[PDB]
Each structure stands twice: as structure tokens, then as C-alpha cells.
Amino acid sequence: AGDCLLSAAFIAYAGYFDQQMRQNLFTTWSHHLQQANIQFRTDIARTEYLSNADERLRWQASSLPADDLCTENAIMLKRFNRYPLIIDPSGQATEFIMNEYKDRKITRTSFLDDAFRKNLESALRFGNPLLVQDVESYDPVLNPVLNREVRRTGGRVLITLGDQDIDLSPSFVIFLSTRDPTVEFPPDLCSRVTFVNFTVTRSSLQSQCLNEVLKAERPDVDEKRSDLLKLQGEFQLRLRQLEKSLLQALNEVKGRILDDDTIITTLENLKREAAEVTRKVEETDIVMQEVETVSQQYLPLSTACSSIYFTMESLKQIHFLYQYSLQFFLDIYHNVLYENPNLKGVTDHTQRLSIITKDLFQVAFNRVARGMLHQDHITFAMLLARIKLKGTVGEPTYDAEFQHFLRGNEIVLSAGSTPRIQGLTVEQA
């Protein structure tokens, strides 16, 4: 009951919130259930509880990012009651949702076109799905279908669209999709959709960055965490399938004593699998602990990475020519992970991390400055410098010093401005 409550509250409420907000809400709900002694499974992961491996592989083949936030959003799109409203600055979600329903012949449309109505009822007749773009100009004619009103009469399901009356064909789904991350919807439309948010934030980008660096630098820890993730449902499903194969073999051979060898091998094989699973269970906590330490070792870099990228985006404020996209910083990170001359023979994990951090700062600065005005280069350097100061350990934050340097120099202290010595001028004083 507790695990179900948490999963449902996540897939129904925890929409439109960034990864950190979703994690915070999940932690609060689990803490309350612990306070209420409701038996919910400890450290559950919602990624695989609500969908086993097969859907994950199909989504990955359906052009979907491997981000944890993206997997949760795909889960939300798979299990929804109110029709979803996709928010994504990039087109990854739209391409994924087209590729997922190619068999059901999903059609593209938008509010602005004059044929939105026509393909709307055309999709309504044959149970054709309908994805609609540019949700900012919402059509009120979509109200009857969003409320899912059914005027069933005479053994058949009916719906009213304006003055027209249509037959509500089953297997019909509508996916609302937008392009602008910054838009304020009316509460009437907000209540009728399950907000699915794909926008990349500090926490989502940091999670992607940490996952990528874990997969690259230490594949063993990545394998261990993937094993922990599968241990909840996928390993049990595989064991159940192997058991079913054992049962079908046993009833096909009728337990003949001549076939015993072919049985025995299989039997012992199964035992080995079970033993392996048991061993994994018997080491779960230890494995978890190790992963945590590794994460705590790689936590700074990822954070710095996130900061760096957002600085790049904020660089559009200084000059109109400094527009940079997530793909550019992703290319920078992929270059600094794999194509490193400095990582040709380095083996010490901490030394590899230090080299990766230093070369990341260097390459990011170089690639940003190659397309930056000369008068701004130093500015960017300081920014990265400040990020490094926030990323380093054993040093004070210097918050007061930096605040004085940037904005603290403009404060009201003209009173008592003595000339002091002849060298000092009035502005110097």
C-alpha cells in the first residue's frame, strides 16, 4: 500500500516540478509514511517499479534520452489518466512520442492551423491519436474531451463537440505539446492535464552529468548500480521465466530417469542464478554504500559542470552573439571524457578526476572564447574561476569579499571622506 501510494502521488502530483523538487516531495511523502508506520518498501525506485525492462528498451529504441527525468516522464506518458501536456524546450519528447505510436498512426497538428478541428474529429472517429502543438493559444472546443464526458445512450458511447455530436471511438489518446518553457496556463486548463516537464534544470543536468561520468570513468560502479536497479523487478522476472522454462521442460519430459541429466544441469543452473541473486541481496547495503562514496567523489565535478553550462546560457545577457545550446556543452563534455590527450595512460581514479576537471575548464573556456568578443574573455575567466572557487575544498567561500568587489562598492559612505594623505584623491579616499 505505501509503495503504491508513493508511486501514484508521484505520477499524479509530481509533475511540472524539476528533479530536485520531485525528489524532495518523494522524500517528504516517504518520511510521512514512516511517521505513520505505513509499510512501504525502503529506497524504492519509481523508474522500474512502474515499468519493467521491455518498455525501457522500447523507449530507448524510440529515440528517448537516457536521463532519469526523461525515464520518469516516459512513465508518466505511459500511465496517465488526464491527457498529458508535454513541455520541452527541445524536440526530443515530440520525436519520442511520434516514434512510440507510429503503429497507431499518430498525426501532427497545432492550434494555429485552420484544420485542427477537421483532423481532430478525423482522429476521433478511427481511434487515431492526436498530438497538438503550440498550446499557448488553447482552443476551448477541447474542453468536452479533456473532461472525458460520456453521453452514453442506447448501448454506445457518444460525445458532444460544439453543435456537432460524435461517436467517441476507443483507443483514442490526445497529447498536448508545447515549445515555450515560460508560459502561464489558466487554472481551468491546468486542472485538466497532467503536466509533464522535460525542461533541463540544474538538478537534471547534474544528474545526467554524474551518470555519464560514472558510466565513463568507473564502469564497474555503473554496472553495480544498474544491477541494484534491476534487482527489484527484472531479476525476479528473469528467475520466474527460467522457472517457467523448467516447468515446461519437466512436463514435456515427464521426469524420465534417462532425461535426468538434462534436467539436473538446468536445475543446478537455476540454483546458481538464485544463489547469485541471493548474494546480491546479501550485499545490497554494502554495494549501496560504495556507490554513495563514488557519487560523493564525483559530486563536485557534476555540479561544476551544471554551473558552467548555465553560465554559458546566461552569457546571452552580455551580448546577443553568445547564444549557446545544451548540445554544445554536451559535445564539450563528451570531448573531455573520451577524446583526452591527457588521459592516454592515466589510471589513478582521483588523478583521472582531477585531469577531467582541469581539462573540462580549459576546453570549455577555449571553445566559448573562440566565439566571444576579446573584451569579454577575462570576464568569462573570472566566472569559471568563481565556479572553481565554489568547487574547490579547503577554501573559504569569500562571499563577503566578492559581494564587495561586485556590488558592495556602491554603498552610501560619502560621510566623513577625509582627504587623508596627499597621495589619496577624493575618489580614492
Binding site: 511540472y16 511517521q35 508506520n37 491546468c190
Partner: protein
């Protein structure tokens, strides 16, 4: 519009109160099987002041958890509005959606687990029969 706001009688259909949410949860989660005889009674966790039993059992604990989830969503929206902004309103239809998803997902999980258990029992019986055959 002051003129329209005076020409008729105004009724403030405010957001559903805590009692309303608790009753909605109880009635919309009734068909579910949530009777746990061995449920220990914790301390603290006030959400509904008028708890139906003074010591809550499993069902009232679960509906109290649901209403607490809704209130935490409200508080999270308020906090996000305070620090910056960018908040979408939370409405009782969200609570209905949450309850419906929770009921459906509980039914699906319970049905799957019971089917797996019955498959286990069928396998146990079949393997006992094969053991008898081997003994013969």
C-alpha cells in the same frame, strides 16, 4: 466587475477542506482491500483533526496519508511561489486523479502478485506429482 458582482448573489465555493478531502478519500478507496489487523498505531502525524477513530487503523492511516500528500503539494506550490514563482494551481481534480491512479495501480499490483502466487502454488502441486511419479 462591481456591477455584476452586485447584480446577483455570490457564493464562495472555496477549495475542498481537510474534512472534505478525507471523506472523498474514504469513499473513493472503499472497494480496495486495506485491512491490516496487525497495524501498530504510531504517534504524531496530524492531518485530519477529526480522525474517525482516536487510534487510527490502516485505512484511516492511508486516507490521512493521501490528504497529507495533497497538503504537501499545496505547501510546495506556496513555497515555490514565495521563492521566485512559476507555480501551477493545485485543484481537487488533482486529488481525484491521485486517488484514481492509486486505486488502479494497487489493483494491478495486487492482481499480478496474486497471479504469481497462484502460479507458484500450481508449480508446487505439479512438482509434488512429479516427485510421486519419481518415487514410483
Amino acid at each position: 466587475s462591481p456591477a455584476l458582482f452586485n447584480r446577483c448573489v455570490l457564493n464562495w465555493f472555496g477549495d475542498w477542506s481537510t474534512e472534505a478531502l478525507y471523506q472523498v478519500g474514504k469513499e473513493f478507496t472503499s472497494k480496495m482491500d486495506l485491512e491490516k489487523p496487525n497495524y501498530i498505531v504510531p504517534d504524531y502525524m496530524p492531518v485530519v483533526y477529526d480522525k474517525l477513530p482516536q487510534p487510527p487503523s490502516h485505512r484511516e492511516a492511508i486516507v490521512n496519508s493521501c490528504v497529507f500528500v495533497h497538503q504537501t503539494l499545496h505547501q510546495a506550490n506556496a513555497r515555490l511561489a514565495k521563492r521566485g514563482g512559476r507555480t501551477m494551481a493545485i485543484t481537487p481534480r488533482h486529488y481525484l486523479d491521485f486517488i484514481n491512479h492509486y486505486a488502479n495501480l494497487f489493483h494491478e499490483k495486487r492482481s499480478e502478485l496474486e497471479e504469481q502466487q497462484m502460479h507458484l502454488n500450481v508449480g508446487l502441486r505439479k512438482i509434488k506429482e512429479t516427485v510421486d511419479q519419481v518415487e514410483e
